[PDB]
Structure 1
Amino acid sequence: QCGENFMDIECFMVLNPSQQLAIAVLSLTLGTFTVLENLLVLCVILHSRSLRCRPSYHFIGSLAVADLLGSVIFVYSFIDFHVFHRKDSRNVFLFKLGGVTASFTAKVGSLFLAAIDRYISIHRPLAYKRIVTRPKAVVAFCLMWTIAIVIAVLPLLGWNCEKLQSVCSDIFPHIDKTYLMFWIGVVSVLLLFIVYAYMYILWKAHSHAGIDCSFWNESYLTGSRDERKKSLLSKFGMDEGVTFMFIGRFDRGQKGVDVLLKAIEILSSKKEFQEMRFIIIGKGDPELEGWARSLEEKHGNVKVITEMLSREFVRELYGSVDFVIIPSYFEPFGLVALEAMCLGAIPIASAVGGLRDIITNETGILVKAGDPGELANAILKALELSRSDLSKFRENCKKRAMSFSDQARMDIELAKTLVLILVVLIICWGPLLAIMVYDVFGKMNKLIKTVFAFCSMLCLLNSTVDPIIYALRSKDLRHAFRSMFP
């Protein structure tokens, strides 16, 4: 009885009473879960000055409201239509459906603003607090929400199959198929780009790395800066002098123990060598490992170490030793440099990869890789600089390391919580955006109408799992909620 383009609204009521009771109870319990969780998310954010001031939680707050407002309007209208068989006019029905559409596109746009926010953090790292001001983020969210609702109000104002005498959708009453066409594409292109963006943010974040500062904390030093040095040197060197430590492997053309072994030889003729002391550590290529051990007893002020050392034994090594040399050819992550600066060792390093990004002029001395003579000058510039008080510089490494590590470790987490929110949105709404595309070109049998009715519950699942993501993936939410509820 419903083959007409202007079909009766009864033919969208595609569910049988046992099916309605199941969908109803599932809608109510699932919806009740979303309500309780999302108002809890908002209350934690809204009632804390330290939270609501960050545009990161304007974004979390945005998703919370987008979930809360859309799901509540949906569950009320969805089951009122299906179980109570509501017979609302074309305007009021399109008005209720509009509230559900505005809420979803607001989430795609809230995801979109976050993608832009991270994009400019990667492309212009130095200008981020000035370009993403809190007020700029507030209005960027504000208008985004308005453009969202405007798209939702177009059918109400006349873009529908009744006012236009066009073709009606078989899923959505009164809705024009051409407006349906337009709506999928607009969120499909955003969601598609957001997918590309979020993968790029996650790749770029993993290009940097940080260390656990608990293991590499200075608090574990048991002795003064000069005395803790003397004793460790006393175990072998038994003298007081500036010490240059190396901790890597003995490959040729990678970590740069080759460049170091050539360097040390040309400092040996100089008189100032006696002030210097060196400690080489690691295991590697048999041709050059003996080269170091041929030099452990030839000059006698150097301990080369071939066997491994526990990561908790070397924390005291980094703190007492005056200098660490990183003559690497490739170092996208200066993890060894980070652990040294985190214990106060001043780093002389190659200008390669992270070493260049981490160490600046105020923290250490940078030398072109592959030139051992330039390295020989580095520890000579480190000799004339060692006599003058360099504790004013020793602490530049103390805070540069602990701050660089926390920006790299942070950015990793944002990139993870982002994609977590994305994938759950895709597998919840992907099926829904597929059944509508099957409607744009095609026809809905009574079956595809029924499964889409049952599949519409996914929008309430998505709204319920999002607060769980924030709860697990945000130590800040946790401490705020924890302090509110002892």
Structure 2
Amino acid sequence: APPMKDYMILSGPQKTAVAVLCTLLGLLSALENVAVLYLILSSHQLRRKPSYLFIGSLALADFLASVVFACSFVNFHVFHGVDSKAVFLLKIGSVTMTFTASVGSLLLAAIDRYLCLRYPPSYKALLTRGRALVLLGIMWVLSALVSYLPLMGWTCCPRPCSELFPLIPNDYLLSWLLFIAFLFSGIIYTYGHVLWKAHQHVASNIFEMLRIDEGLRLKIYKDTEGYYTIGIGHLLTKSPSLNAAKSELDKAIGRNTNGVITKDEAEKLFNQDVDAAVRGILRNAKLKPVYDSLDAVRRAALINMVFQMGETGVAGFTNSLRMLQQKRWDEAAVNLAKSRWYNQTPNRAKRVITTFRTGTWDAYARMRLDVELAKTLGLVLAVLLICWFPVLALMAHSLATTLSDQVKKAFAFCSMLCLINSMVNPVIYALRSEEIRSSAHHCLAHWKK
């Protein structure tokens, strides 16, 4: 067995550079993750959701790693940690376990999203707060079984020893890398289908946009003012009679409907309504030059305002209408927010204003906080695969050919990428997830007062 002093590679002032770097990154990583743990455990809305308990497990795995990895690195490489066989095996085992549980935590987070977006009503019956905690229990245990295997007697006694890690053999190293490669393929396969479904949820039409705002109904209904209406906001009559509304319906369709229409018949009526909206805008002196400047997505947002308050009402935002034409999306957003339209109907106005600001369909989606979480996980997975790749690629090269002293020096500094990855994650979750964003605002109220 080769002594631990042979792996202790450092060259004077270059060791003091890692001593300040590893300490500062390790302190920042631990403080960023412990905030994410507090925020989830403190907020009533988060702790009860099985989706946020998997995120919490990633924050725990990253926090335990940050502390173990930095204290074991600065002790081994900088201060020269003369550790005995038993003490060293549990240290290397603790490092492996806290890292394996992160990959595991991600895999469960990716299957949680697939079941939610693929089978929506069956998810509440399947994933429960208790059932999630049990599933998180099996994972942490399996992680400890795989990682603590050299401590059980799988060390390099007659078998060839590894280049980078003391006491661990190449047959174990190859087995752990192959296991991690299979977990990554499993995450990729699921996230491949997750994207496909998450995409089918967001609107890509005016019909799909106005379905969220007006509400598609195939039987006669009453609006906020009380008028008899059908389909996607199609007005039947201005009188209080149902028979008058029924007669107007049979004339509009061309057959005896009896108060019930087909989806294809509802879309045919909607296409006649859109044509009349656009022809109206063209014959309005104020609305015509604005419709001409706006793009296809933004035009659908102005048609939406016409369906809600008519042509005479939309022409009343003289200062906003000019800001929109001049392509000053930011100055018009604040100008339209100070309107009574925003005061009366906040949700409809907020969704319309954001479309005029971004030029996307992103505000219009069924289960949008569930779709946006699937969008956040994808960015977390991408950063993981970027940061771990050079570290993993060197370990695979470690099995193929004998490594030089200078290459071993590169790996010590290279492994610092595992510490930046853990620092990038709590910034993404605090900037993209709205539920983590609002939980931090409600917690600061109790901290200050």
| TM-score, normalised by the number of residues in structure 2 | 0.69
Aligned to 1:205: 198
2:405 paired with 1:470: no
Q: Is the 8 A contact 1:38 1:68 kept in 2?
A: yes
* Cα distance in 2, alignment partners of residues 432 and 465 from structure 1: 17
Does the 8 A contact of 1:198 with 1:418 survive in 2? Answer: no
2:70 alignment counterpart: 75
User: How do 1:85-484 and structure 2 match up within 5 A?
Assistant: 85-162=80-157, 165-210=158-203, 216=213, 224-226=225-227, 280-281=272-273, 305=279, 311-312=301-302, 314-315=304-305, 317=307, 407-484=366-443
Q: Match for 1:108: what amino acid?
A: V
RMSD: 3.7
Distance (whole Å) between structure 2 residues aligned to residue 230 and residue 104 of structure 1: 57
Q: Which residue of 2 aligns with 1:333?
A: none
Distance 1:194 1:230 in 2: 46
Q: Measure how far apart 1:449 and its partner are.
A: 0.5
Deviation at 1:267, TM superposition (A): 5.4
Whether contact under 8 Å (1:282, 1:306) holds in the other structure is: no
Letter in 2 for 1:186: F
Count of residue correspondences: 348
Measure, in 2, the Cα distance between the counterparts of 1:454 and 1:278.
63
How many angstroms does 1:209 deviate by? 1.5
Task: Give deviations 1:331-373, integer Å, cap 9, x for gaps.
Answer: xxxxxxxxxxx99xxxxxxxxxxxxxxxxxxxxxxxxxxxxxx
1:19 paired to 2:14: yes
Which amino acid in structure 2 is aligned with residue 89 of structure 1?
Answer: S
Q: Deviations over 1:253-286 (max 9, x none)?
A: xxxxxxxxxx979559xxxxxxxx9982556xxx
Paired residue secondary structure (2:165): coil
In the aligned structure 2, how far is the partner of 1:485 from the partner of 1:57?
20
Normalized per residue, the structure richer in helix is 2
Whose radius of gyration is greater, 1 or 2? 1
Describe the shift of the 1:244–1:264 C-alpha distance in structure 2 as closer, same or farther (beyond 3 A). closer
Give the drift of 1:405: 5.9
**Are the equivalent residues in 2 in contact too, given 1:42–1:64 (CA < 8 A)?**
yes
* 2:44 corresponds to: 49
Q: 1:89 to 1:142 in 2, by over 3 A?
A: same
Contact 1:30/1:460 (8 A) holds in 2 = yes
1:86–1:8: structure 2 CA closer, same or farther, 3 Å change rule?
same
Q: Is the 8 A contact 1:280 1:305 kept in 2?
A: no
C-alpha spacing 1:303/1:419, structure 2 compared with 1 (3 Å): closer
What letter corresponds to residue 435 of structure 1 in structure 2? Answer: L
**SS of the counterpart of 2:150?**
coil
In 2, Cα distance between equivalents of 1:445 and 1:435 = 12
> 1:204 deviation in Å?
1.4
Distance 2:411 2:56 in 1: 29
Counterparts in 2 of 1:82 and 1:204: CA distance versus 1, 3 Å: same
Partner of 1:387: none
Counterpart residue identity of residue 88, structure 2: F
Deviation at 1:153, TM superposition (A): 0.9
C-alpha distance in 2, partners of 1:93/1:106? 20
What TM-score results when the alignment is normalised by the length of structure 1? 0.64
SS, match of residue 146 in structure 2: helix
CA distance in 2, matches of 1:451, 1:212: 53
> Aligned residues: percent identity?
40
1:447: Cα distance to partner?
1.7
- Please tell me whether the aligned partners of residues 227 and 237 of structure 2 are also in contact (alpha carbons under 8 angstroms): no
- Paired with 1:212 and 1:267, the residues of 2 have a C-alpha distance of 29
Q: Describe the SS at the equivalent of 1:485.
A: helix
**Structure 1 runs, 4 residues or longer, greater than 3 Å off:** 210-213, 215-218, 227-234, 240-245, 263-268, 302-316, 404-408
Could you say if the C-alpha distance between residues 279 and 18 of structure 1 is closer, same or farther in structure 2, counting changes exceeding 3 Å? closer
Does structure 2 retain, via aligned residues, the 8 Å contact 1:244–1:278? no
Closer, same or farther in 2 for the Cα pair 1:266/1:480, shift >3 Å? Answer: closer
Give ranges in structure 1 of 5+ residues lacking alignment.
1-5, 235-239, 246-262, 269-276, 284-301, 321-341, 344-403
Tell me the amino acid that sits aligned with residue 408 of structure 2.
K
The letter for the 1-side match of 2:370 is D
Question: What letter is aligned with 2:373?
Answer: L
Do the aligned residues in 1 keep the contact of 2:55 with 2:109 (CA within 8 Å)? Answer: no
Secondary structure of 2:201's match? coil
What CA deviation, in whole Å up to 9, does each residue of 1:186-245 have, x standing for no partner? 1111112212321320121101224779x9489xx99833399999989xxxxx857999
* Aligned partner of residue 129 in structure 1, secondary structure: helix
State the SS of the aligned residue for 1:160.
coil
1:411 to 1:191, Cα distance in 2 relative to 1, 3 A:
same
Structure 2 unaligned runs (5+)? 216-221, 239-243, 257-268, 283-290, 292-298, 311-346, 349-362
Q: Secondary structure at the match of 2:10?
A: coil
